[PDB]
Amino acid sequence: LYTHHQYIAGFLMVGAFAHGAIFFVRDYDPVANKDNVLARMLEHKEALISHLSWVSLFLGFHTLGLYVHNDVV
Amino acid sequence: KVSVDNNPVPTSFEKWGKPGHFDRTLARGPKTTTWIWNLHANAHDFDSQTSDLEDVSRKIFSAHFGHLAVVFVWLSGMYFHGAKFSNYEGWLADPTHIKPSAQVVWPIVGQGILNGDVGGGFHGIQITSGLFYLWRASGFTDSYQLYCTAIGGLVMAALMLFAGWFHYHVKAPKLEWFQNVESMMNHHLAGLLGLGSLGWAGHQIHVSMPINKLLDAGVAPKDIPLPHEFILEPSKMAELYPSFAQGLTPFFTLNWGVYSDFLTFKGGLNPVTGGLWLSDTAHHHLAIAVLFIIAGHMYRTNWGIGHSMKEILEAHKGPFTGEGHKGLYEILTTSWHAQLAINLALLGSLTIIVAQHMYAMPPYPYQAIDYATQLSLFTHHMWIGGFLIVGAGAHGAIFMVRDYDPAKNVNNLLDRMLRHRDAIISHLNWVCIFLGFHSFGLYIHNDTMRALGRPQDMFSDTAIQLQPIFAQWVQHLHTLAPGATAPNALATASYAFGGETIAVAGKVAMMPITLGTADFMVHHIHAFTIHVTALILLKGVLYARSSRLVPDKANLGFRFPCDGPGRGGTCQVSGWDHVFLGLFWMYNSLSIVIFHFSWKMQSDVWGTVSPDGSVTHVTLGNFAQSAITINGWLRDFLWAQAANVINSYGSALSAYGIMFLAGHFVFAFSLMFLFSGRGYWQELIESIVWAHNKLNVAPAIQPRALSIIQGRAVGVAHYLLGGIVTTWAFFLARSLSIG
Amino acid sequence: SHSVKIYDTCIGCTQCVRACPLDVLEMVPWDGCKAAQIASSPRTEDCVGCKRCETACPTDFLSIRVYLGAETTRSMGLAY
Amino acid sequence: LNRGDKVRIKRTESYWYGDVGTVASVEKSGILYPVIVRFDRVNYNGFSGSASGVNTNNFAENELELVQ
Amino acid sequence: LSGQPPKFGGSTGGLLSKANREEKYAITWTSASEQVFEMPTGGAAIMNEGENLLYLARKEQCLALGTQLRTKFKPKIQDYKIYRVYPSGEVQYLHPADGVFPEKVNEGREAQGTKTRRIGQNPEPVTIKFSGKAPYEV
Amino acid sequence: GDFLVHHAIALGLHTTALILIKGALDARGSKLMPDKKDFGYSFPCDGPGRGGTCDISAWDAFYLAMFWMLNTL
Amino acid sequence: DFANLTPCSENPAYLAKSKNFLNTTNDPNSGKIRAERYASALCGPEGYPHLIVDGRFTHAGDFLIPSILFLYIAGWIGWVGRSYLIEIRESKNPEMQEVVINVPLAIKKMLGGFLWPLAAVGEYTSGKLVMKDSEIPTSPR
Amino acid sequence: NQVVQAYNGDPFVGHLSTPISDSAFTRTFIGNLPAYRKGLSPILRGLEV
Amino acid sequence: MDGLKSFLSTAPVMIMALLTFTAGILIEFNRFYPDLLFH
Ligand code: CLA
Ligand code: CLA
Ligand code: CLA
Ligand SMILES: CC1=C(C/C=C(\C)CCC[C@H](C)CCC[C@H](C)CCCC(C)C)C(=O)c2ccccc2C1=O
Ligand code: SF4
Ligand code: SF4
Ligand code: SF4
Numbered sequence A: 001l002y003t004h005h006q007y008i009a010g011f012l013m014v015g016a017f018a019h020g021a022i023f024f025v026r027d028y029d030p031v032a033n034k035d036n037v038l039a040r041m042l043e044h045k046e047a048l049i050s051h052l053s054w055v056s057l058f059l060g061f062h063t064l065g066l067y068v069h070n071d072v073v
Numbered sequence B: 001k002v003s004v005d006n007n008p009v010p011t012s013f014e015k016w017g018k019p020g021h022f023d024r025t026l027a028r029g030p031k032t033t034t035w036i037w038n039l040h041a042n043a044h045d046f047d048s049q050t051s052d053l054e055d056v057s058r059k060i061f062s063a064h065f066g067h068l069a070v071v072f073v074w075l076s077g078m079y080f081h082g083a084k085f086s087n088y089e090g091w092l093a094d095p096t097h098i099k100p101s102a103q104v105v106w107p108i109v110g111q112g113i114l115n116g117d118v119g120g121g122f123h124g125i126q127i128t129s130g131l132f133y134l135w136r137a138s139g140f141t142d143s144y145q146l147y148c149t150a151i152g153g154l155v156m157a158a159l160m161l162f163a164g165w166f167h168y169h170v171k172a173p174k175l176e177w178f179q180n181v182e183s184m185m186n187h188h189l190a191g192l193l194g195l196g197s198l199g200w201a202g203h204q205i206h207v208s209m210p211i212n213k214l215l216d217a218g219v220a221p222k223d224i225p226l227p228h229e230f231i232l233e234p235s236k237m238a239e240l241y242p243s244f245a246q247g248l249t250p251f252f253t254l255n256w257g258v259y260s261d262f263l264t265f266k267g268g269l270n271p272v273t274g275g276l277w278l279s280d281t282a283h284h285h286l287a288i289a290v291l292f293i294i295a296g297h298m299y300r301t302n303w304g305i306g307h308s309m310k311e312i313l314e315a316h317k318g319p320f321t322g323e324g325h326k327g328l329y330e331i332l333t334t335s336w337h338a339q340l341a342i343n344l345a346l347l348g349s350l351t352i353i354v355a356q357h358m359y360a361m362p363p364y365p366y367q368a369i370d371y372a373t374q375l376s377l378f379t380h381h382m383w384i385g386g387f388l389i390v391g392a393g394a395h396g397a398i399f400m401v402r403d404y405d406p407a408k409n410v411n412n413l414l415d416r417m418l419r420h421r422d423a424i425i426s427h428l429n430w431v432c433i434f435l436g437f438h439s440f441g442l443y444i445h446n447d448t449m450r451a452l453g454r455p456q457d458m459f460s461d462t463a464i465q466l467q468p469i470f471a472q473w474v475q476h477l478h479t480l481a482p483g484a485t486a487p488n489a490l491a492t493a494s495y496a497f498g499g500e501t502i503a504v505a506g507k508v509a510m511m512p513i514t515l516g517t518a519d520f521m522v523h524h525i526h527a528f529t530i531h532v533t534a535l536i537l538l539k540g541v542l543y544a545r546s547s548r549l550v551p552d553k554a555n556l557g558f559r560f561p562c563d564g565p566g567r568g569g570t571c572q573v574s575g576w577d578h579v580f581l582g583l584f585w586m587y588n589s590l591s592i593v594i595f596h597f598s599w600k601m602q603s604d605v606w607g608t609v610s611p612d613g614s615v616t617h618v619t620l621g622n623f624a625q626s627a628i629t630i631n632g633w634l635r636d637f638l639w640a641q642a643a644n645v646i647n648s649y650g651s652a653l654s655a656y657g658i659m660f661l662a663g664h665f666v667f668a669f670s671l672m673f674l675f676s677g678r679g680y681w682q683e684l685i686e687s688i689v690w691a692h693n694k695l696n697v698a699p700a701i702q703p704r705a706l707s708i709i710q711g712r713a714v715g716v717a718h719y720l721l722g723g724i725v726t727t728w729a730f731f732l733a734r735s736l737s738i739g
Numbered sequence C: 001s002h003s004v005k006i007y008d009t010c011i012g013c014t015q016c017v018r019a020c021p022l023d024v025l026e027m028v029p030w031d032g033c034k035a036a037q038i039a040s041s042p043r044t045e046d047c048v049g050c051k052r053c054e055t056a057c058p059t060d061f062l063s064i065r066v067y068l069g070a071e072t073t074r075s076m077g078l079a080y
Numbered sequence D: 001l002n003r004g005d006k007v008r009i010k011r012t013e014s015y016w017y018g019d020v021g022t023v024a025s026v027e028k029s030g031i032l033y034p035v036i037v038r039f040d041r042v043n044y045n046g047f048s049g050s051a052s053g054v055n056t057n058n059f060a061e062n063e064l065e066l067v068q
Numbered sequence E: 001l002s003g004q005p006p007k008f009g010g011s012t013g014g015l016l017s018k019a020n021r022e023e024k025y026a027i028t029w030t031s032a033s034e035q036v037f038e039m040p041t042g043g044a045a046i047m048n049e050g051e052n053l054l055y056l057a058r059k060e061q062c063l064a065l066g067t068q069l070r071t072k073f074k075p076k077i078q079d080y081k082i083y084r085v086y087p088s089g090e091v092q093y094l095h096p097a098d099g100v101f102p103e104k105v106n107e108g109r110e111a112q113g114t115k116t117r118r119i120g121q122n123p124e125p126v127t128i129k130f131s132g133k134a135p136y137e138v
Numbered sequence F: 001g002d003f004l005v006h007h008a009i010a011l012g013l014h015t016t017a018l019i020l021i022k023g024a025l026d027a028r029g030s031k032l033m034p035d036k037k038d039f040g041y042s043f044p045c046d047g048p049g050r051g052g053t054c055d056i057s058a059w060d061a062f063y064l065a066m067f068w069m070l071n072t073l
Numbered sequence G: 001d002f003a004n005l006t007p008c009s010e011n012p013a014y015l016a017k018s019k020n021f022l023n024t025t026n027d028p029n030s031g032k033i034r035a036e037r038y039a040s041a042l043c044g045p046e047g048y049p050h051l052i053v054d055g056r057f058t059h060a061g062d063f064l065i066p067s068i069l070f071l072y073i074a075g076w077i078g079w080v081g082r083s084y085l086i087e088i089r090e091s092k093n094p095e096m097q098e099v100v101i102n103v104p105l106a107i108k109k110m111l112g113g114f115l116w117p118l119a120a121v122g123e124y125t126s127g128k129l130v131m132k133d134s135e136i137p138t139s140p141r
Numbered sequence H: 001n002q003v004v005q006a007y008n009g010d011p012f013v014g015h016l017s018t019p020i021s022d023s024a025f026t027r028t029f030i031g032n033l034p035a036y037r038k039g040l041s042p043i044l045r046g047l048e049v
Numbered sequence I: 001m002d003g004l005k006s007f008l009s010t011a012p013v014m015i016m017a018l019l020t021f022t023a024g025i026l027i028e029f030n031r032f033y034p035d036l037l038f039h
Helices: A002-027 A037-042 A045-072 B034-041 B055-083 B131-137 B143-169 B181-217 B234-240 B256-261 B278-295 B309-314 B336-360 B371-402 B413-419 B421-439 B441-451 B469-479 B481-485 B517-542 B575-604 B630-639 B654-675 B678-694 B708-737 C015-019 E059-071 F002-025 F058-072 G012-018 G030-038 G057-090 G103-110 G113-125 H024-030 H042-048 I003-008 I011-032
Strands: B004-006 B117-119 B171-173 B502-504 B507-510 B607-609 B615-617 C003-006 C026-029 C037-040 C064-067 D006-009 D020-026 D035-038 D056-059 D064-066 E024-031 E050-056 E081-085 E091-093
Touching: A002 F002, A002 F058, A045 B654, A045 B678, A045 F002, B055 B131, B055 B143, B055 B171, B055 B336, B131 B181, B143 B171, B181 B234, B181 B278, B336 B371, B371 B517, B371 B575, B371 B708, B413 B421, B421 B441, B421 B517, B441 B517, B441 B630, B469 B481, B517 B575, B575 B615, B575 B630, B575 B708, B654 B708, B678 B708, B678 F002, B678 F058, C003 C037, D006 D035, E024 E059, E050 E059, E059 E081, F002 F058, G012 G030, G057 G103, G057 G113, I003 I011
Parallel strands: none
Antiparallel strands: B004 B171, B502 B507, B507 B607, B607 B615, C003 C064, C026 C037, D006 D020, D006 D064, D020 D035, D035 D056, E024 E050, E024 E081, E081 E091
């Protein structure tokens, strides 16, 4: 039951973001959504994508570093 | 025939500081980071930096000399490590209890634990190459001789560097010198292979035979005479071999029968060491020497005698092939890529033949004693051979797209090859699908019938039986060979076909290898995977020029990713991508080959013979009933034999556990480059570039993502690296745990 | 069939019309550039979608676009 | 706009959107995009594995913002 | 469709059943000199003196042949005509549809496939919702 | 032992979120392809031009984040 | 607090392990000095020393001292590379000097990293550390 | 003495006239299987197949 | 000789000299003061 619902939850979260992308392709009007929170999501997407890049790189470098350190010693 | 150009290029340092000087698309300067990868990928594409066929040949000649310098540096390293940092002086006295170790580890972070007790008080990594058995067979006795060999190799490496500098920079030969291939094979057969085999036969007569016969008698290495003491006083060699009292006057009068004392066609294995006799080894090199020197006087040269390759090729025309080979001599003498294709195919097949012969007829003393050396050597040479065969496919494709113009060969063998590519690839598709259904589908059928509780329906030896009747017949013919079809052979060619279990030092050197239905099924898997690798590589070679999909692959090049998303998507139509897929299939094929070998020797050959005469094997006959289902391979081979590599922590074998996990990591990492595409990574690099621009640290060399071919190349490189490192650790930790 | 559209940013450099394998494109006269020519796509039912025309276009972003759509026999490159 | 002028791109399409570039020429023959702006930074152009793209584009007068 | 065929020995690469059920393509070129070219179907053939008639199954094969006729021969063969012939019988005329090759401006062609904007002023899919169209073709 | 696996789980969540929002926000186009709204959600590629454009669609970011979701779970 | 972890001095398991610590170096007393060094740490029932990363100053040497040390000698690397890259962008060929490193300039920049946090606050107050959002190239938004 | 011509004298069809595909024995044997034999109604050739 | 100067100044030679120098100082610090899990 735990593994089943965590796998369903992962699939549904990935589908939520997939339909966020499909919304941004198809149903997103940048004229009506002028300067609101969605327009300002897209107006700084490089900043938050680079910060997700930093945090995932940081956390991955050091989780693998600690695991490989523990493993080697 | 020797004509050279004197000082064709000055020896100057100025081109060193300007990288990319060789290729005209890189001589402007690096705009992006793709310039770096292009600088490395085009560094040895000599045939694309220029198109003279003369300067590329000089570049190739001097590159060969530099490579020989590298090989001699490596070989000097091997001999120097056996001289100084090894227990060869100790192992030579007692080569049945203590183990070779040619590498000590500096203790820095606790890695002095890798200096495991190898024997005799020496501490270091137990090596798995047969260097110590090689040096025992070649007659080495003291570390000073190994030191002299290492120093001589370093001198010869300096000589190869000097010769490469000489033949590019002060005296480079002309094109007509390279196109003398008949003189070239005369010297390579008669003078390189023939005189090399003759010189080694002389060494084995005068050094290997005395030193190894006294070491077999039971004399300590300190009491062993130095190898020139058997030359300065031939009376000592007369003490050992009574046929040296007659001198060479029996040789020059064809009284060769009196040399049967040491030149014997004895056959079989030496019972006291487990290796081949060096009697028939020296005789073998003498026969190879005579045969190669005889064959080196075939092709025509300055003198009117000889036999020109051009007329030999043009003489061979039949009804089916039309015009025949008249057109092929201009192919192989005006293109280094066709030469590289044929030489890579034959060198890969030779390395595989080396792997398959050096287990069944172990040519070195005490090689079959230890299973680390045997398994490591077989695995190593299988991997080298498969890599070289994939290279043959690669350069077949490069030749077809680059060095093949159909003007100079109409309706010859290569044209008629290209005119029925659909028939060849069709029937090779059919045989790949046939063997994949009837070699793996038997495994799935057995696996299902064992899961369903129907073991009488399986393809077992105690069920529906698929006996390899032809291989069993051939084994019968080779057991019955040394009496009828080889009268002067005393023993069998190898004990792998049949005969007696050769037990030396309590361990099985070689015993007959029985072929049940498990071996039938595994050999048809071998045939299947070899055929699919041949399918991918042959498809690349044939379809390199043009297909029905992309009719202009020849002028898009060899390394092009695709033609575009059109025609449904032509994503991997190049010949390079067929090399890329053949690398995966070669990895699959050779990993099945080495798993078959490792399990068959652990279950059916290797083991400990009790003094009562019974043989107990390492995995106790698993292969007969477990090697017919996939669960038997996953349970009795991969799961059961990795207990030695994953429980090895905190011991000397813990480096192999680390390397095991490292290979898994590099496999999983390779999947990032294999599964992804350039587009995602470019728009992620753009956001990272934005983060650099925001705080004024953006580079002037623009960070492109890896190209499409670059991404595929690094994916396959890390995939094969991770898989081969995992298997290397698994084999070299299983084998040191079984003796 | 795929639709090949040519935009105002064309500089008449002819690179697309000779990079095209099937010669879908052709140059027509124009008054909006120095070269006095713009690419057109008359026989665009013969477009396979290879996008060698987009690859050869020097103007940034792109003066020629291929918009992959309804496949046919001509636009899929089937010899059978 | 004149030669040598540094301008900032507002095309919203170009690779050099927001990037500065020296003006190389202005054309007076009544064409749609007469200003040839040439950049230090090369774009995404060429076949795959090409070591560089192009550093030149033709922009209109209205798209450029003069920064010199 | 006049012209003797090239002296080709035959091949498995070539005309499948698509040729006699739907269209196949013929390339006709005239050369003074007999020489050797690479057929895109695989192999090498013989250019006859005068007119040639080569039947192929794809238009890309015909244009690839015409491309190598143009660029791989020093006496460049540029009077090559590509037809599309149907099994019903009628012959279309395809590649030099006007007099001159498509790279050269004939000044009598029509600008079709040309949009009056750049890609930045392309309409966006949210405006054309459930319209049966797509953002390029509006 | 739970610290390091929670940080590995955080790494998986962050990298899956990075791929998913990099497909969601770059669904309208990056500098590699300033028009992806007109090709739609799941177009294959944009040719070997512009350096090579293999997995540029937002659907391909779904694809990669599907791998990362399966890994994290 | 921290009743789950006992100090390794009064721990049975750690005494059982510290009887047999190995020698990581050539020195035959490396295991003994390591056992003496880890005796002041906090370790659980397994007998292996645990680190405490709260920022409590009783365990500041567990994480915060390496934190400060890394941040200094990595802001060194970042600031030196940034200063060199900014410097080479006015040399009429900024792209070749990434390939061939101008080593007198490079060593001058590398020995300029003693004062990077002062240089960082100087460049941040004087506006050279960051760039305006409009001045930098960006994607379509 | 060439034994591999083009199929049926047509050098541009995708077939060769090899001794297996287009021999006299193959013509008389493949062309006399029920799927190819001349004059048979489909019921008898289907019955024989 | 300005060519060896410009070749020893390249990116791979300088990055390998730098990595060898940092590896040397790390290895020497581990050789003298072996096991530093914390302060
Ligand atoms: C007799 C050996 C032989 C020779 C000399 C050639 C020579 C050449 N080949 Mg090659 N090739 C061969 C074997 C050989 N090959 C084999 C066995 C393979 C099968 C894998 C191929 C597959 C092949 C391909 C597919 C291509 C060539 C190409 C080339 C040309 C340029 C090579 C280049 O620039 O790479 C420069 C060197 C590198 C890029 C280094 C590669 C790094 C390796 C693969 C990974 C690291 C390996 C290492 C053992 C791992 C440890 C490192 C790390 C963990 C520390 C040149 C003609 C290219 C060509 O001509 O195309 C136009 C081309 O694309 N080769
Ligand atoms: C386990 C993984 C896997 C499997 C099953 C396959 C399967 C195959 N690959 Mg391969 N491949 C793999 C991974 C895999 N590959 C990967 C990782 C790559 C590396 C990139 C490739 C690269 C690749 C290339 C490059 C080529 C293939 C080709 C082939 C085919 C060989 C023909 C064959 O074996 O007969 C078919 C046998 C099987 C599929 C396995 C037996 C399965 C049983 C007997 C069938 C199932 C029973 C029944 C029908 C089930 C029906 C149930 C009902 C409810 C429907 C076959 C489809 C080659 C090909 O197409 O040759 C013509 C080819 O050229 N492969
Ligand atoms: C010295 C130059 C420089 C400096 C100041 C920065 C600074 C920045 N980078 Mg980094 N970066 C650089 C080099 C540089 N980087 C290089 C060479 C690479 C290629 C691998 C990257 C790739 C990279 C990625 C992929 C990301 C960053 C990010 C960041 C930010 C957070 C710090 C970080 O994550 O470090 C991470 C650093 C690395 C992963 C690699 C560092 C490589 C070495 C150690 C730096 C020194 C390079 C060079 C040798 C210096 C020359 C010295 C001079 C004497 C010649 C920060 C703005 C992140 C971001 O988006 O911020 C929000 C992020 O996601 N960078
Ligand atoms: C991650 C990734 C990138 C991004 C990769 C980049 C930006 C390369 C980064 C290389 C870094 C700088 C390391 C360079 C090489 C290292 C020095 C190797 C270290 C190995 C030692 C241990 C020997 C692509 O560009 C790409 C392109 C096409 C398909 C898949 C992918 C892909 O998966
Ligand atoms: S390649 Fe682009 S710029 Fe050149 S003519 Fe064609 S559409 Fe115009
Ligand atoms: S997509 Fe290919 S075939 Fe179509 S117009 Fe462009 S270049 Fe020509
Ligand atoms: S660019 Fe990539 S996805 Fe597109 S056709 Fe080429 S290989 Fe395939």
